[PDB]
Amino acid sequence: EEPRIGVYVCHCGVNIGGTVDCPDVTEFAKTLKNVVVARDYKYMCADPGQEMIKKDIKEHNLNRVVVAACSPRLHEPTFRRCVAEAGLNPFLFEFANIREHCSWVHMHEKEKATEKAKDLVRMAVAKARLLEPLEFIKVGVTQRALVIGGGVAGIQTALDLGDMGFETILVEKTPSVGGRMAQLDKTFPTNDCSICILAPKMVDVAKHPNVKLYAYSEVVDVQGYVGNFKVKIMKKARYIDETKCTGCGQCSEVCPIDVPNEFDMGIGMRKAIYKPFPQAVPAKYTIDKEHCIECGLCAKVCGPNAIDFDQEPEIIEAEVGTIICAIGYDAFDPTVREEYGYGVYDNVVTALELERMINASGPTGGKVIRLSDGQKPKRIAFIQCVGSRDAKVGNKYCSNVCCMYAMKNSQLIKEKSPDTEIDIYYMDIRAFSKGYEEFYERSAKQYGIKFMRGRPSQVIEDPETGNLVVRAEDTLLGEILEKEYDLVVLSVGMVPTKSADEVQKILGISRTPDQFFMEAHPKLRPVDTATDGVYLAGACQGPKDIPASVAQGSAAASRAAIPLAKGEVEVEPIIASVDAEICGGCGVCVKQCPYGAPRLVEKDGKVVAEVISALCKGCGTCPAGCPSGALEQDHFKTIQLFKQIEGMFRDT
Amino acid sequence: EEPRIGVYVCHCGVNIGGTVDCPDVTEFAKTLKNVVVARDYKYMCADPGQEMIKKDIKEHNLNRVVVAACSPRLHEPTFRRCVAEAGLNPFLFEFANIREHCSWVHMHEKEKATEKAKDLVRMAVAKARLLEPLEFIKVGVTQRALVIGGGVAGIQTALDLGDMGFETILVEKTPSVGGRMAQLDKTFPTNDCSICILAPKMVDVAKHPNVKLYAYSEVVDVQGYVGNFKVKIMKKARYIDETKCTGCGQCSEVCPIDVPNEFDMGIGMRKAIYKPFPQAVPAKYTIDKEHCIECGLCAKVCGPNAIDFDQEPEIIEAEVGTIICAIGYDAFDPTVREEYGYGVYDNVVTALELERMINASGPTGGKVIRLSDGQKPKRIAFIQCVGSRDAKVGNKYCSNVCCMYAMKNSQLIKEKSPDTEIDIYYMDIRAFSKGYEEFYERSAKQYGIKFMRGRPSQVIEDPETGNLVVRAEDTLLGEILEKEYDLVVLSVGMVPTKSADEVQKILGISRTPDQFFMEAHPKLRPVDTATDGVYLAGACQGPKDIPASVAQGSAAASRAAIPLAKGEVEVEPIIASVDAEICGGCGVCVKQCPYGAPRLVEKDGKVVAEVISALCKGCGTCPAGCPSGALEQDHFKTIQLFKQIEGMFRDTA
Ligand SMILES: Cc1cc2nc3c(=O)[nH]c(=O)nc-3n(C[C@H](O)[C@H](O)[C@H](O)COP(=O)(O)OP(=O)(O)OC[C@H]3O[C@@H](n4cnc5c(N)ncnc54)[C@H](O)[C@@H]3O)c2cc1C
Ligand SMILES: Cc1cc2nc3c(=O)[nH]c(=O)nc-3n(C[C@H](O)[C@H](O)[C@H](O)COP(=O)(O)OP(=O)(O)OC[C@H]3O[C@@H](n4cnc5c(N)ncnc54)[C@H](O)[C@@H]3O)c2cc1C
Ligand code: SF4
Ligand code: SF4
Ligand code: SF4
Ligand code: SF4
Ligand code: SF4
Ligand code: SF4
Ligand code: SF4
Ligand code: SF4
Ligand code: SF4
Ligand code: SF4
Ligand code: SF4
Ligand code: SF4
Ligand SMILES: [Fe+3]
Incomplete structure (x- = not known):
């Protein structure tokens, strides 16, 4: 026709x-x-x-x-x-x-x-x-889900999926689940103990009948399409027997290597054999082989002899139908803003270092102390928008939580030391959600916290005392301030997590200008990706607080449950196929495909090529490289693109 | 023991x-x-x-x-x-x-x-x-959900549940789904049309095989508990057989009367025979009797014969296992802030009125005009935080979206008229989510929009010219400004919807200090309520934008699907029960329970009270009111409380 x-x-x-x-x-x-x-x-x-x-x-x-x-x-x-x-x-x-x-x-x-x-x-x-x-093309949907990242957002997604009756795998890269929420002392605007409310969720997910938790593990390969993913999980070696080890921690003393305790943002040192934090789930100790010198002194003190260096990583092959990425975020490194002096002055700290200092389980026993002399600081300055709303560092976005967490920890410091003076140097106070504006008023009226509208221009250390001078225009007075402080806290923003690059290549998902992961559309599909069967939840999708990540966790669970419940999805038939009457079996096309779909076979007493429709994703590379023209990907035939190129200049 | x-x-x-x-x-x-x-x-x-x-x-x-x-x-x-x-x-x-x-x-x-x-x-x-x-106590779960409110949030919840395979009812108070998003022209920060994102959802929801849409309907009664709710829906009478209705609109042309069109916030005027807006779903018309005169004129031009004045509201009874409240919000009425002159000055308007003015499908054909001159205003002032962050109006909260929608409509006005000067009077610019700060930078750098940091003290109308003067301090200069404007837009905040009191009374849920509905936990249960089987989604849970409302709709569907998927839940046994050997059927308890749990029964010739365990929520009011002590609430017995009082003063020895 x-x-x-x-x-x-x-x-x-x-x-x-x-x-x-x-x-x-x-x-x-x-x-x-x-x-x-x-x-x-x-x-x-x-x-x-x-x-x-x-x-x-x-x-x-x-x-x-x-x-x-x-x-x-x-x-x-x-x-x-x-x-x-x-x-x-x-x-x-x-x-x-x-x-x-x-x-x-x-x-x-x-x-x-x-x-x-x-x-x-x-x-x-x-x-x-x-x-x-x-x-x-109708394909069956594997009745299992995969969640990458065991923070509050990934935990929420697994619990929701598990509670629906779907088998779910939860993969956590570090030894313990919990995410950065496990590092916080309290949470605005209620000032709930962060770990004390999250730990029941961590307990629930480890005990859940429909959730398999792979801690100290990472997804290293994902293959296939929606409902038909085949994934590899590398259960990294702790070099300790989960079955034969107590979790008491009597092998650290017999360790000569001190390692930056990353859970405490490097303020305190940890041993080569360690447990991240006391409330860790699973509560089992680990040895960092990177800093391990294999001198074996821990093994002599170890009673159970759970210590085995021979321990090898085990690869898990599992079929899932949907994947939820929830790998979180990292804190911005404020060294690049040299005028503030981070990494140069002792008494300049990031706000996430502050969380660890204030936390009772933290390295300092919950005591805010200057890192130069160990004394308690009586004057503290908070600097907002560090690493955010800043074109000079490439981060032109708002990190969403720094206004609230800066007022929060200002409250928690005041409670432990009412006579502490606390100034917050801000541009806009963004207290935008339920109870946030009230929390902002409370910080000033009840806790006597001071607010200076003026982004600081630089921090100057007094080399005698170690104290810090913050210099800023009080824009609401038209005068330049130069107040002295004993400790300066940089309200650093949020950036994607270190491994976001690795995860991005494995899942095949994009990134927004802020470098976080790209949803299909901010309003049509806020937790979908343009990759069918792959979804997002939490701060890995962009800066946001805990209730927002939890909501996305649940949202991503609903969205990921739709194909699982349907049991059947449709994929695009934009696949390549070989014309056997034109194919002479050249062999060029078989190495071009990264999934090995084109193969050399003998047909009609002769060699032709043939593509397994199931292994073809439709990129169209092998038809473009085919010398005989036998290969063609439907919906993107050379003749169709030819007519499209003509259409720019003339009708046909 | x-x-x-x-x-x-x-x-x-x-x-x-x-x-x-x-x-x-x-x-x-x-x-x-x-x-x-x-x-x-x-x-x-x-x-x-x-x-x-x-x-x-x-x-x-x-x-x-x-x-x-x-x-x-x-x-x-x-x-x-x-x-x-x-x-x-x-x-x-x-x-x-x-x-x-x-x-x-x-x-x-x-x-x-x-x-x-x-x-x-x-x-x-x-x-x-x-x-x-x-x-x-284990109870079964009816495999069906109910969504109340058909905005983005409620639509999203219904589509997700329906897509999961659960039967879902979606009750919409107005003739059309879509909510306030339907009233917006564009939406930040992508500046899509609202229709771009919403209308396909409105289409999908209407023809979904697992979603029964009850437009122009309201829930009027809910009884029971998680997994076992018995709800009554009043499906109001449109006076047009919808099955026969075409939606062509021929009837509206003949109507001889005019009516203030609420969808246009009292600006545009409609007929008593109407459909809310040109993209309304269901694409059916409605007759409003408050103004109908019954001259038959509408029926004469209608081919199908759908018009029918004998229609009566029908009550539907449905079993559901879970309920999601998504009844949205209303704009703040800035009349009470007398210094700004809304309701007094012609050219002072709310932002939601501006959306209806700027919208292509709007009563003004998408033309921003002064409501006194009819002319296009060349100088416009935006006033932020109207009805928000204000103890004088009892609203001490931030309404979340007004900073962004003010910059949004400023970009759109500049696009339709680059000559317009636009000044935004603000305290904080709250551009806090993805692309928002960039949207904020773009509004100033690219669209040349002006920002005054200073909350205006009053608006002075020029009675002669309808022009408005805005008195405010430029706090960043330390000087008092008195600029003149052809139109002032009040960035009103969000407040609970008028019918929120009715819905709250029916579902039995709480409210936060801001008068929105209270989530079960402010951190880990953002869409649950303390009432099992009842959930929240959208702006009725608190001021928020569309992406947040959509994510909540999908979150509420996941939470509300957990009981449906499990097919069974557990209820706490801190409930009241009758000791038959102590009760002489005095009848004191019956009327005390708001759920009708205690009942008078006849077993062994005598009358005795009896508590339907499933209907008891565990308040303990009627055990406290029982004069014989036959009625006790487990875990809060009178004898248990008696021991606790003694323990304050002495060991119970
Ligand atoms: C200083 C500070 C204070 C804050 N205060 C508050 C507050 O008071 N209230 C509040 O609500 N919010 C606060 N926030 C924000 C809060 O931390 C986040 O909203 C929350 O952590 C988001 O949880 P998440 O799961 O999405 O990401 P995360 O908490 O970061 O969790 C991600 C998880 O995935 C794991 N992971 C990472 N990469 C991989 C990989 N490749 N494979 C497998 N697993 C991986 C991580 O180990 C982590 O366990 C604060 C943030 C900061 C920086
Ligand atoms: C001027 C203005 C501009 C805005 N601009 C933007 C923007 O650019 N971008 C953005 O993301 N957000 C914007 N917002 C916010 C946006 O409007 C909300 O986030 C969104 O409308 C919330 O959707 P909702 O479904 O939760 O509530 P609603 O949109 O209000 O929908 C509620 C629905 O429930 C129905 N309902 C109400 N009561 C009952 C009842 N008793 N029984 C049954 N049904 C009932 C209503 O008819 C309505 O259809 C703006 C808000 C305003 C005021
Ligand atoms: S510690 Fe004692 S108190 Fe602090 S939380 Fe765990 S329990 Fe409640
Ligand atoms: S010591 Fe031997 S045992 Fe005590 S913990 Fe380290 S390993 Fe498990
Ligand atoms: S071996 Fe590697 S780890 Fe075990 S102790 Fe000597 S160092 Fe610390
Ligand atoms: S939040 Fe407060 S601080 Fe963190 S960025 Fe947006 S503004 Fe600067
Ligand atoms: S290339 Fe074109 S021709 Fe050479 S084999 Fe693969 S298909 Fe047959
Ligand atoms: S097309 Fe892209 S994908 Fe389909 S086969 Fe040739 S290469 Fe492998
Ligand atoms: S309207 Fe619907 S279609 Fe026309 S553009 Fe905006 S979205 Fe694409
Ligand atoms: S006329 Fe009869 S049919 Fe054509 S619209 Fe008005 S009502 Fe529906
Ligand atoms: S009847 Fe009621 S509706 Fe039909 S036209 Fe005369 S008025 Fe408009
Ligand atoms: S949003 Fe911008 S405007 Fe609406 S309140 Fe919070 S601040 Fe005032
Ligand atoms: S009140 Fe106490 S006693 Fe009188 S009936 Fe209800 S129960 Fe039996
Ligand atoms: S307790 Fe509160 S609820 Fe349970 S029955 Fe007596 S009254 Fe009705
Ligand atoms: Fe606790």
């Missing part, structure tokens, strides 16, 4: 129509070959727009639909379901992006943006003519 | 031990009858502390545990599981609070704090002796 195309140009209210002359684009679209219907409407995705398309598909017997509107990364599934409801195969639909790619980037050149939209419509119509009916 | 009690005093580092002499409390506890083991430990809720209790339960054969530490509101579930692991029934454990209620409030009176802790331990032991082993 000859193509009968319907072209629909959206205004997106004014987001498109304000820049692109949408009526003039629809008029141009009618002059194109095979276009029988062309309309422009304010919202194509709204109910009147979808009913319009479907009514045209039936009344005009359309076999192709072109929508010139937003990105297909937003609404391609939406319109594929729309046209499929009217009978039209979902892959006779072509998307033209005239918003993100045109109207929003050419606002000052309306005439050229309109001409450009016409070209983009024509390139779409060109490819549309050669599109073919494809069948969505 | 004679009580064998273990008493555990906790130091909580020095939180308790610094003020209360715990070793002294411990020694005193061993003087009380039935105390077999007593010890102080630094962290009782820590694993070594729990292992110390469970291990004593077995070695010393204890049948009661007292822990003097923090509040039961924190660790009561913690220690109940601890003792259950050791074979001891969880209701033979009693919590004494010596931190929140003693050491932390008597820091300067240590001697008296120690003596107080001793009385609090003795009162705990005293009740502990008479505690009884109880069993959790």
Whole structure:
């Protein structure tokens, strides 16, 4: 049959129509070959727009639909379901992006943006003519979930999934689950003991019948697609027998290597054999082989002889149907802002070091003391927006929690020492959620905490005393302040965690300008990714507090449970296939695929290539490299792209 | 069996031990009858502390545990599981609070704090002796959910549940789903149209095979408990057979009367025969009798014959296992702030009115106009924190979104009219989520929007020209500014929706100080309530933007799916029951229970009261009111409370 195309140009209210002359684009679209219907409407995705398309598909017997509107990364599934409801195969639909790619980037050149939209419509119509009916591929969904990261956000997702009756694997890289919440002393705005409320969750997840917890483990390989993932988990060697070891810790004394205790942000030293923190789950000790000198003194003191250096990492192969990434975040390193003196002055600390100093289980026994002389500081200055809202360090975002945690620990210091003077140097106080503004008022009226509106310009150490002078304009007075402090705390912001690069490559997910992981859309799908069957939860998706991470944890559990409950999803048939009559068995294509889908086989008494449809993801590399042209990926054939290139310059 | 009690005093580092002499409390506890083991430990809720209790339960054969530490509101579930692991029934454990209620409030009176802790331990032991082993009551869960409110939050909850395979009811008060997002033009920080994100969801929800949508309907009664709710829905009468209705809109043209259109916040005027907004779902029309005149004019032009004045509201009865409240919010009414002149000055408008003005599908065709001149204002002032962060109006909270939506609509005005000068009067710019700070930088750098740090003191109308003058200090200059504007927009804050009182009364849930609905825990249960089987989602739980409301909708669906997926839950047995041999059916209790649990029955010829265990929530009002003592609430018996009162003054020996 000859193509009968319907072209629909959206205004997106004014987001498109304000820049692109949408009526003039629809008029141009009618002059194109095979276009029988062309309309422009304010919202194509709204109910009147979808009913319009479907009514045209039936009344005009359309076999192709072109929508010139937003990105297909937003609404391609939406319109594929729309046209499929009217009978039209979902892959006779072509998307033209005239918003993100045109109207929003050419606002000052309306005439050229309109001409450009016409070209983009024509390139779409060109490819549309050669599109073919494809069948969505139904695949079974493995009734198991994987959660990477055992913080409050990942714990919440596993408990929710486990409580629904889904088998769930929880992989935690460090020896213990708990995340940074396990490092906090208290939590604003209620000042609940952080570990005391979280520990019952850590207990629950270790004891849960439907949750397998792999602590001191990391995901090292992910293969397959939604509902059909095959993952490798490396259970790293503690070099201690989980079964034969107490957790008493009488081998550290017999260790000559002192190692930066990362749980305490390096303020206190830990031994080569260690337990991260007392409330750790699982409560089993570990040996850091990186700093281990293998002198064996611990093994002589060890009674059970649980110590075995021969211990090897064990790889777990497991099939899951959905994956939730919840690997958290790290604290910004404020060394780059040299005028503040971190790493140079003894008495400049980050706020997350402060959390460990204030915490009773912390290295200092909960006592805030200067790192130069060990005395208690009587004057303390907080500096806000350190590493955030700062183009000089590349972090132009707001870290969301630093305003609240700076007032929090100012309250906790006042409670342990009422006569401490505390000044907070801020730009905006962002106390934006339920009880936050009240917490902000409380900090000033009840705890007498001072607020200076003025980002400090530099910190100057008195080399005699070790004290610090903070210099800032009191912008609410128009005068330059130069107050002296005994301790300066840098309210450092949040950055992605160190391993976010490794995880990103394994899962195949993107990143937003803030370097955190990219949701499919901030409002349509706040915890989905554009990778089907992969979801986000918590601070790894962006800076946020505990209730926000927990909500995302539960949200990601709901979203990840949909394919598991359905038991069956559909994947795109944009796969490569070999034409046996043209393939001469050259061998070029088999090494090109990273999943080994193309293979050399003998057919009809001769050698041809053949691709296992199940191993092909649809990248299209091997068809592009095929010398004979026997390889082709559907929906992206060379002839279809050829017509699209012609469509820019001329109709066909 | 004679009580064998273990008493555990906790130091909580020095939180308790610094003020209360715990070793002294411990020694005193061993003087009380039935105390077999007593010890102080630094962290009782820590694993070594729990292992110390469970291990004593077995070695010393204890049948009661007292822990003097923090509040039961924190660790009561913690220690109940601890003792259950050791074979001891969880209701033979009693919590004494010596931190929140003693050491932390008597820091300067240590001697008296120690003596107080001793009385609090003795009162705990005293009740502990008479505690009884109880069993959790298992109940089935109806495999269906109910969502109340069809904004982004409620829609998201229904689609997630429906997609999981659970039958779901979605009740929407207005003729159309969509909520306040439907009223917005664009949405920060992507500046999509609201229709971009919402309308496909509205479409999906209406045709979902597992979602029954009851638009123009309201819940009017809810009875029962988790997994066993019996709800009554009043499906209001549209006076148009929806099955026959086409939504073409031919009828609206003929209508001879006009009506203030609430969807446009009293700006645009509609017919009594109407559909809220052009993209409304269901795409059906509604007749409002408050103004209908019944001349048949609408029916004459309608082909289908859907119009029908004989319609009567229908009441639907449905079993559900879980309920999600997502009834949204209302804009603050800034009339009470007299200094700004809303309701007095023509050209003072709220921000939600501005959204209806700027929206392409709006009564003004997307044209920002002065409501006095009809002209386009070339100078516009935004005033932040209207009705928020203000003790004079009883709203001491931050409404979360007003900073961003003010910068949003400023960008959109600048796009439609670059010549417009826009000044935002603010205290703090709260651009706190992903891309927000960048949105904030973009508003100033790219769109040349101006920010004045200074909360305006008053708005002075020019009666002659309708122009407005805004008096405020430029706090960043130390000078008083008096600039003139063609239009002033009040960035009003969020407040609970008018019908929130009705919904609260029906579902029996609490409210936070800000008057929004109270979550079960402010940190770890953001979408649960203290009422089992009832959950929250969206702005009715507190001021928040669309991404947060959508994430809560998906979070509430996960939480509300746990009982549905389990098909069974447990209810606490701290319930009331009748001793048939003591009750002579006086009838005092029946009317005391707001859930109708106690009932008069006839067994063995006589009348006797009887409590339906499933209907009892454990308040204990009617046992306190029973004159014969036949009625007792397990775990709070009169005799148990009597012992506790004596324990304040003497050992129960
Ligand atoms: C100084 C400071 C004070 C704060 N105060 C508060 C407060 O008072 N109240 C509040 O609500 N919020 C506060 N926050 C924010 C709070 O810490 C976060 O909201 C919270 O930690 C988010 O939990 P999460 O699980 O999403 O991330 P995380 O807590 O960081 O947990 C992520 C987990 O994943 C693990 N992980 C990381 N990489 C991998 C990998 N490759 N494989 C497997 N596992 C991995 C990590 O070990 C960690 O256990 C504060 C933050 C800071 C910096
Ligand atoms: C001027 C303004 C601009 C804004 N701009 C933005 C923006 O740009 N970006 C952004 O993300 N957010 C913005 N917001 C916030 C946004 O409006 C909310 O986050 C969002 O509307 C919350 O959705 P919701 O479903 O929770 O509540 P709602 O949107 O209010 O929906 C509640 C629904 O429940 C229904 N309902 C109410 N009572 C009952 C009852 N008794 N029975 C049954 N149903 C009932 C209502 O009819 C309504 O459909 C803005 C808010 C305002 C005021
Ligand atoms: S979304 Fe894509 S489609 Fe729905 S409106 Fe904005 S643009 Fe037109
Ligand atoms: S010492 Fe031997 S035993 Fe005591 S802990 Fe270290 S390992 Fe387990
Ligand atoms: S061996 Fe490696 S670890 Fe065991 S002690 Fe000597 S050092 Fe510390
Ligand atoms: S939060 Fe308060 S501090 Fe942390 S960034 Fe946004 S503003 Fe600067
Ligand atoms: S390359 Fe083209 S031709 Fe050479 S084998 Fe793979 S397919 Fe057959
Ligand atoms: S296409 Fe990309 S993926 Fe499908 S096979 Fe050839 S290579 Fe492996
Ligand atoms: S128990 Fe309540 S009090 Fe005793 S420690 Fe754990 S928390 Fe601090
Ligand atoms: S006319 Fe009869 S049908 Fe056409 S809309 Fe008004 S009502 Fe629905
Ligand atoms: S009848 Fe009621 S509704 Fe139908 S037209 Fe006359 S008025 Fe408008
Ligand atoms: S949001 Fe910006 S505006 Fe709305 S209140 Fe909190 S601060 Fe005042
Ligand atoms: S009140 Fe006490 S006594 Fe009178 S009936 Fe209800 S129960 Fe039997
Ligand atoms: S206790 Fe409160 S609830 Fe349980 S019955 Fe007596 S009254 Fe009704
Ligand atoms: Fe505790």
